Amino acid sequence: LRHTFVVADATLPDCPLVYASEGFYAMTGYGPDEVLGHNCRFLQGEGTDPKEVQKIRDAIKKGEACSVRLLNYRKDGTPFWNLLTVTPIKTPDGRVSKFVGVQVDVTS
Numbered sequence: 001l002r003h004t005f006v007v008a009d010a011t012l013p014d015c016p017l018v019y020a021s022e023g024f025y026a027m028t029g030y031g032p033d034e035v036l037g038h039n040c041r042f043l044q045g046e047g048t049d050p051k052e053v054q055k056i057r058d059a060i061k062k063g064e065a066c067s068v069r070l071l072n073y074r075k076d077g078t079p080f081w082n083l084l085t086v087t088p089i090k091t092p093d094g095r096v097s098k099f100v101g102v103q104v105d106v107t108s
């Protein structure tokens, strides 16, 4: 459906974003000069459920996939509901090299 896609670099200790689709920039209001190099958590805000955030934190430290419903905020401060699925991408030696994210605005 209508979705956006990013790639995070697991070879760096805090999974910075290294690629983002045109949709991600158009959806969030942020340019590449403010997204690339940074961890995705900047989209979070006051009403983001810390329990759900922690489901992602654990799934990333454990190298598993994960799906969560998060409240995110565009650059202009307005909120929206981000259905987010993170998938680990391993090398042949079983080590996680990248994390890929599909984000869907499910505000409906």
Ligand SMILES: *[C@@]12=NC3=[C]C([C])=C([C])[C]=C3N([C][C]([O])[C]([O])[C]([O])[C]OP([O])([O])=O)C1=NC(=O)[N]C2=O
Pocket (backbone or CB within 6 Å): 006, 007, 008, 015, 039, 040, 041, 042, 043, 044, 053, 054, 056, 057, 060, 070, 072, 082, 084, 086, 099, 100, 101, 103
């Ligand atoms: C974010 N999308 C997103 C995409 C990928 C590929 C990854 C790996 C993470 C995200 N996040 C979350 C963020 O990077 C982090 O994993 C979590 O905040 C949990 O860890 P912390 O240390 O912050 O407790 C995404 N977060 C969002 O809020 N919106 C997304 O689109």
